[PDB]
Amino acid sequence: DLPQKDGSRALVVAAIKETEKMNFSEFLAAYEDIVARSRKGKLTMDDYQGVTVSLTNPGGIGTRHSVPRLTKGQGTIIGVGSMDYPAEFQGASEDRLAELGVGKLVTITSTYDHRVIQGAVSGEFLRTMSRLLTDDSFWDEIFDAMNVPYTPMRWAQDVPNTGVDKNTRVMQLIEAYRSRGHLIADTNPLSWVQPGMPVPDHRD
Amino acid sequence: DLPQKDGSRALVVAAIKETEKMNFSEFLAAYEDIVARSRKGKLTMDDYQGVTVSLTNPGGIGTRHSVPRLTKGQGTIIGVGSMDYPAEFQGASEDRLAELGVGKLVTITSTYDHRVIQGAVSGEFLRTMSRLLTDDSFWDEIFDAMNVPYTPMRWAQDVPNTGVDKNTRVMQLIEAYRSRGHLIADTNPLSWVQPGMPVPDHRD
Known part of the structure; x- marks a missing residue:
């Protein structure tokens, strides 16, 4: 939606082209290009043609x-x-x-x-579309592109507060990070893992 | 109390002598001597004289x-x-x-x-007498004599189940023994501690 010289609002549809050849990083760049040029009046005739x-x-x-x-x-x-x-x-x-x-x-x-x-x-x-927005593989691909070092939050049902109390479980999480948290820390200035060496378990 | 030949019960008082020069081990031996000899009729006249x-x-x-x-x-x-x-x-x-x-x-x-x-x-x-039966030093002396490897249970007031729940506290005790319990284990066949070396903390 771009306002006219008079003041009256008038919606027009611009196109992000060749989207089937893009990853999330490429897609985000292409999107923000169209929004940028619209705000400073630099869209051409070709930008408005060929929408599928x-x-x-x-x-x-x-x-x-x-x-x-x-x-x-x-x-x-x-x-x-x-x-x-x-x-x-x-x-x-x-x-x-x-x-x-x-x-x-x-x-x-x-x-x-x-x-x-x-x-x-x-x-x-x-x-x-419903499945993708709750899927592990989908959120892995986005995090990879944007260089987020942590594992994504996963989809699950709420569990009942039975057996081992939830307060005990939160205290065991504090001990895990104080003991084993160095295994996932931003310590390497290269994005390098030596292929010969074995990777330690850090599910904890 | 020793029964007679007829059957009628008759109480008599026997004496543990020179008790102010004994530790708990010595005291227990002296006691069980008098009880033993009474059950097999081998007390003498001197055993019944000199009670204070x-x-x-x-x-x-x-x-x-x-x-x-x-x-x-x-x-x-x-x-x-x-x-x-x-x-x-x-x-x-x-x-x-x-x-x-x-x-x-x-x-x-x-x-x-x-x-x-x-x-x-x-x-x-x-x-x-009241103070002694609740005192740390008293129970330390008895355990030392009988060769009990653990620390004695101490006297304290019951505490309320507030703040960190008591279930969380019992789970932290299980982790302590699984990690640090080897520091108090019956591993040395001599009653020997090398005086030069420093003793690790095991309050946990």
Whole structure:
């Protein structure tokens, strides 16, 4: 969305091209190029031509979901809604929500041309997006690209406070870092691991 | 108490002599000598002469305390009563007593000749006996004599289950023994410590 000389807002769609040949680092650079040039009025005619698929974000303002229109030339448009708690939880305590294990959600929509795309394909597409945003391999690939030294947080169900108390478990974590934490420390100025030597276990 | 040929029981007092020159090991030997010889009828006239102070045990049967008689020649007689719970707790659960922190008690009496011993002396005597049976130095001396390798249990008040939970504290004790327990193990066939070398800390 770029404002005009008069003042009236007018949305136009610009394209990130050849996206099937990019890693996350390359993708992030390409994205921020389009946003940069738009803010200083340096987009050309070629930037607005050749779009295959589109993305919209009603969730910015706080809309829960939308049913948008599809422009001629394309097959699908994807929409991203709000990342808040549901309205039935918007007056509850942080303490009570933390006890139960209530998370935030995002709603995603797919609007498609029925002459060329069938409903089973559209459902399978949204199922793959759901799996990726909770998948170990997906978050490993992003961390690798951005040079984050730690292991990513993994997806799991909340466990009950039975057997060994959770306070005992937090004290055992403090001992582990004080004893074995040097095994994952940013000590090597090269990104080098000697292939001959054996790697110690650091699951602790 | 030795039974006669007829069957009728008849108590007589035998003496452990020169007791002010003995350690606990020597004392235990002298005691068991008198008890042994009595059971096989080999006490002499000299064993029954020269008693200065006496000890009686009504607590054996379960009496709580007694006011006994003093025989001519001596100045005091000491009596030891029952080592049970009080009668008001004799129908309570082991669980409820353990929660509160209720211990067992022993009652001790002193019967003295008032022409030579005053009441203040008799009270000070019973206060010293109370202190000794809870004292660190007393139990160190007994353990040393009998060759017990561990430190004795010490006297303390029950502490509340606040701050770090007691379950966390029991798990830290298991880790201590698995790591540092070799420092107090029965590994040396001599009772030898090299005086030159420094002794490691094993308070853990």
